Structure formats: C-alpha cells, structure tokens
Design a protein around this ligand. Structure first.
Ligand SMILES: [Mg+2]
Ligand SMILES: [Zn+2]
Ligand SMILES: [Zn+2]
Length: 299
C-alpha cells in the first residue's frame, strides 16, 4: 500500500447489551438476557433424534442448539420486581450475563424489591447469589413452597443421582443468603403477589413450577418460565417433553394449557428459553401453535 496505509480494522465481535424494553400498560418490562448455552436437544428431547433433527432443519437449526436464558424485570411504579435471575456461574462460562445487562438497562441490584422464581433450576436462581451473599440486598425472593421444599431439602440431594445433585446444591447455595436473612417468602399455588402480578401454578417441569401473570390497563404478559425449551419442536408438537422435566406428563399438560389459553386470549407470553427476548403472541396453527415475536419498538 501507499506510505502509512493503515491495517484493516479488526472484527469487534461483541454483542450488544442483552436487554429489551417493552411497555405493558403503565408497567415497564425489560427482558434481560443471561447469555446463551448450547443444548444437545436431539438427546434431551423425549422423542427419536431423527424427528428432532427433521424439525430443527425445518427452522434452519441444528443440534447442539444455542438456547437463550431469559429473565424479566417489571417496574410497576410502586415496585421493581425481577422474574428469574439467570445462572450466575452455575451452568458454565457462557451464562451469568444478567448482572451486566441489568446495569446496562439502567437499574442496580439494590433497587429490586421482590424477585419471583419460576422454578429452582440453576439457570433461574444462580443469579441470586454472588460470593455467598445476596446479589439483591433488599429483595424478598418468592417461589412456590413445593419447589422450595423439593430443591432445598438435604434428603432429596442425597437421594439424587450424581449428575443431578448439583441442581440441589446450586439451589441451596443460591437461596441461602435470603433464607438466613428471613427474606425468602414462599407461596402456595395461585397467589396475588403485588398489584399487577400474580403467581399461577404450572407444575410439572418441577414440582413448584410457577407462571407469573403481569397485567396493567388491560395489557397482559404471561411469563411461562420453562413451559417450553425448543421452539422449533414444541410449538408444532406441544406433546414432546424434555429430560429436564421432573414430571413430563404434567409438563406437557401445562404447556398445552398455556398455549391454548394464550391463543384464545390473544395476550403476550414471555418464556425463559425462547430466543431472546422471548416475548410474543401465540396463535393456533392446525394441531399445534405458531409464535409471533413482538414487533421491534423504540419509545
Ligand atoms: Mg456458539
Ligand atoms: Zn428448567
Ligand atoms: Zn431453565
């Protein structure tokens, strides 16, 4: 090149901050990404790999599938509440981004009033704890009593097979600061939590798996937790379950109920493992369902 020609600019590669703002009536919703993680869904889904492979190909995907891990912040005006918290470092080095994305979204952990846990798998409770301390120093954490009593019981850890013991260890370590400080407040099934947010039992994926129903000024968003893991399989065929389910029959029943109710009601859903931000509508589509992601909107 000519004298002092500059080298070609290197690729930057880093992703944009993983948060997405959406108004819901008077409430401000911020989808928060914890990162993604590859899942061997051909092996984990409870059907023959060839059927999964064919379904993935139809959506231009292949296993291992990069799967989003999402949480949802809701500012109701009177309360700042966080639904799920990501994995922290419990599920590998690609997750644990929630804390940075919360900061990029303009909030600090000390501002969070209440945290609602859909279920105590590591990629939903790991974000509660850092350095054996509560990462959210003012928050009250709530989850179903059945989930608490299953995952936070020493007997169930000691009965669990070796490759499942970490789920109980991680849940206990994640909840312990709050339990010790008197800031873990269970509920039992369908419960009003704060004005505008209710717990709706959706048991199956875990014994206390809970859906959170957010409503303001007639605008409803139903946060489904882990009622779905693999959009490219489970919207066309909601009967396909996954090894991560504690009770796969109940999990399939709860997913079918939620999809049918959302199709009938025409309201928004948000789900922890739909491609970030994981927010959209559902319409019936023959024997299955079609997801309609929200339109990109800027205030
Ligand atoms: Mg990758
Ligand atoms: Zn889960
Ligand atoms: Zn999950």
């Amino acid at each position: 090149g000519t004298i002092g020609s500059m080298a070609a600019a290197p690729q930057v590669k880093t992703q944009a901050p993983g948060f997405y703002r959406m108004m819901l009536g008077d409430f401000e919703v911020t989808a928060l990404s914890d990162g993604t993680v590859d899942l061997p869904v051909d092996k984990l889904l409870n059907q023959p790999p060839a059927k999964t492979q064919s379904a993935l190909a139809k959506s231009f995907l292949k296993a291992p599938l990069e799967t989003s891990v999402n949480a949802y912040l809701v500012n109701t005006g009177s309360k700042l509440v966080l639904v799920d918290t990501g994995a922290a470092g419990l599920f590998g080095p690609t997750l644990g981004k929630l804390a940075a994305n919360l900061k990029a979204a303009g909030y600090q952990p000390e501002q969070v009033d209440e945290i609602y846990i859909t279920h105590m798998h590591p990629d939903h409770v790991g974000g509660l704890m850092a350095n054996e301390q509560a990462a959210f120093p003012n928050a009250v954490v709530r989850a179903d009593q059945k989930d608490a009593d299953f995952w936070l019981s020493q007997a169930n850890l000691d009965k669990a097979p070796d490759d499942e013991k970490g789920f109980f260890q991680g849940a206990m370590a994640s909840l312990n600061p709050y339990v010790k400080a008197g800031k873990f407040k269970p509920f039992s099934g369908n419960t009003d939590l704060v004005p505008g947010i209710k717990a709706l039992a959706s048991h199956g994926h875990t014994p206390g798996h809970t859906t959170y129903v957010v409503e303001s000024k007639g605008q409803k968003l139903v946060l489904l937790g882990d009622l779905i893991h693999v959009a490219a399989v489970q919207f066309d065929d909601p009967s396909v379950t996954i090894q991560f389910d504690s009770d796969s029959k109940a999990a399939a029943a709860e997913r079918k109920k939620a999809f049918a109710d959302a199709a009938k009601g025409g309201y928004l859903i948000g789900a922890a493992h739909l491609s970030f931000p994981g927010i959209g509508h559902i319409r019936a589509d023959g024997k299955g369902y079609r997801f309609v992601p929200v339109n990109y909107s800027v205030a």
